[PDB]
């Protein structure tokens with residue numbers, strides 16, 4: 539079919555912080571050879587994830603603030619594993635320069651140019667909660683409606699999160715973003731802690747005011763809701779103005795949600811930047827080579843479309859997959875490790891196509907398609923490089939006319955990068971741009987990134 543694409547760089551929307559993943563629950567250790575990954579492939583995996591030149595150039599790493607009093611199973615151990623006795627008692631903090639592999643990972647990401655580290659707690663330690671357990675949800679003692687005999691642990695949890703941040707900064711790795719909940723809706727056998735919008739809002743202000751007293755500059759986030767509409771449901775709570783004249787929203791830099799219980803397909807009703815902070819296929823299926831087959835949950839194109847929809851329809855500034863690389867034959871990670879073997883999925887190459895060319899502080903700009911089989915997004919980088927992502931979900935190749943409209947300079951060359959059943963992230967021959975317009979074919983069932991050269 540013939541499709542006209544029109545890009546208007548004068549119609550500008552949200553800014554981009556970028557793309558990344560987590561290595562939480564000891565999956566950092568997989569990248570560092572726990573299951574036999576060779577030194578060559580450890581370096582290769584870190585290059586795929588964090589090198590702009592050789593891989594995806596991911597700009598966000600989401601690390602877990604461990605709540606556990608051991609490192610058995612897949613547990614993330616805490617800097618304050620055992621009760622100090624009472625909320626006012628002196629904490630016994632312990633720093634291992636490790637954080638379940640996440641500390642060295644952070645160093646090696648940063649060494650390759652990673653700007654943003656997002657530290658997120660799944661739970662306060664057990665002894666700070668109503669149920670005296672890091673597991674099975676429960677509430678931080680002292681938040682509205684949730685008293686405990688042992689007293690009020692709110693300030694203690696804020697001081698604990700700040701201590702985690704200081705250990706990182708004093709070891710040469712500043713944390714840029716901090717969250718204190720993960721999926722507060724979920725009652726599960728692993729690290730988890732509940733709260734509604736009002737309870738979340740109450741702690742945002744305590745944590746915010748605590749970081750101001752300590753003179754620590756960091757971006758606060760909430761609430762990593764299990765789904766987008768679950769996060770939406772908490773935002774009015776975060777927007778309630780208390781007698782102090784402030785909302786939790788006044789302290790937040792970023793509102794965060796997951797895609798599991800509902801996908802980012804509409805804009806959250808906050809004035810802050812929004813991030814999709816966790817999403818993957820948890821079916822247990824294994825589809826590393828499939829860009830398109832039947833629209834399965836683990837397919838390359840499914841994730842190409844999740845990403846494009848999140849930016850174009852859900853107005854996000856970042857997209858963070860769940861696990862980057864893990865020793866498994868499931869779709870829960872983007873890169874499958876099989877002992878000393880690296881298999882990057884089409885889900886990874888889809889993320890890489892966006893991340894490689896849509897760099898931090900890029901602005902999303904208007905892009906329209908004359909045919910629904912061909913979906914488009916466009917971003918302008920701060921250096922002026924325009925990156926246009928085109929998903930052709932046609933059963934046949936699409937002949938595109940792409941019109942960049944009025945630009946700052948003039949555009950003379952554009953380079954296509956293709957992802958499909960046949961290609962990972964394949965650089966094609968440059969295309970001549972005449973009067974800020976060019977012709978291009980895109981294959982059936984493909985993602986193409988068109989990147990302007992100078």
Ligand SMILES: *[C@@H]1O[C@H](CO)[C@@H](O[C@@H]2O[C@H](CO)[C@@H](O[C@@H]3O[C@H](CO[C@H]4O[C@H](CO)[C@@H](O)[C@H](O)[C@@H]4O)[C@@H](O)[C@H](O[C@H]4O[C@H](CO)[C@@H](O)[C@H](O)[C@@H]4O)[C@@H]3O)[C@H](O)[C@H]2NC(C)=O)[C@H](O)[C@H]1NC(C)=O
Pocket residue numbers: 606607619620621664665668669670671672673
């Ligand atoms: C190191 O950290 C671990 C993990 O956080 C701690 O182990 C937990 O300790 C807590 C506190 O005693 C235990 O909490 C209790 O959990 C019960 C659930 O019991 C069963 O269910 C699960 C899953 O099927 C099993 O893992 C478990 O073994 C049990 O068979 C709750 O029913 C209890 O609730 C009662 O007490 C609370 C708190 O006072 C009340 O609010 C309740 O209403 C109710 O009366 C209780 O919450 C927890 O089970 C332990 N987990 C594990 C995995 O062992 C260690 O305590 C900690 N060690 C140190 C030294 O700090």
Ligand SMILES: *[C@@H]1O[C@H](CO)[C@@H](O[C@@H]2O[C@H](CO)[C@@H](O[C@@H]3O[C@H](CO)[C@@H](O)[C@H](O)[C@@H]3O)[C@H](O)[C@H]2NC(C)=O)[C@H](O)[C@H]1NC(C)=O
Pocket residue numbers: 552553805806807808809810811812853855
């Ligand atoms: C999509 O997300 C972006 C954030 O990435 C949202 O931008 C935010 O828009 C609001 C409302 O326009 C801005 O607040 C306003 O600020 C101006 C200038 O200070 C002021 O005149 C208004 O009274 C109001 O407070 C906010 O600054 C802006 N946020 C950022 C980070 O730029 C955008 O609104 C979202 N779009 C949709 C449709 O939800």
Ligand SMILES: *[C@@H]1O[C@H](CO)[C@@H](O[C@@H]2O[C@H](CO)[C@@H](O[C@@H]3O[C@H](CO)[C@@H](O)[C@H](O)[C@@H]3O)[C@H](O)[C@H]2NC(C)=O)[C@H](O)[C@H]1NC(C)=O
Pocket residue numbers: 576578579878879880881
């Ligand atoms: C580092 O990782 C690479 C990439 O996984 C490893 O190389 C790959 O090793 C596997 C063997 O486990 C090879 O798989 C074989 O591929 C052929 C097809 O070409 C297939 O017919 C066989 O059944 C088998 O699956 C793979 O080809 C191979 N080399 C590549 C992709 O270049 C490597 O062994 C790891 N270690 C080191 C030290 O590099």
Ligand SMILES: *[C@@H]1O[C@H](CO)[C@@H](O[C@@H]2O[C@H](CO)[C@@H](O)[C@H](O)[C@H]2NC(C)=O)[C@H](O)[C@H]1NC(C)=O
Pocket residue numbers: 831832833834839840843931
């Ligand atoms: C691309 O088009 C195909 C149909 O040609 C869509 O595939 C369907 O996807 C759903 C789940 O989204 C499956 O339940 C159906 O079985 C699929 N139909 C097939 C394979 O015939 C696919 O969703 C489209 N992808 C887009 C628009 O991103």
Ligand SMILES: *[C@@H]1O[C@H](CO)[C@@H](O)[C@H](O)[C@H]1NC(C)=O
Pocket residue numbers: 572573574865866867875876877
């Ligand atoms: C790593 O994953 C593969 C594939 O699932 C599995 O068979 C293997 O046993 C795992 N390695 C170790 C050392 O457990």
Ligand SMILES: *[C@@H]1O[C@H](CO)[C@@H](O)[C@H](O)[C@H]1NC(C)=O
Pocket residue numbers: 682683684734735736737775
């Ligand atoms: C949140 O929880 C508290 C304590 O149960 C309750 O008082 C409050 O009304 C709840 N907030 C909302 C918005 O339901």
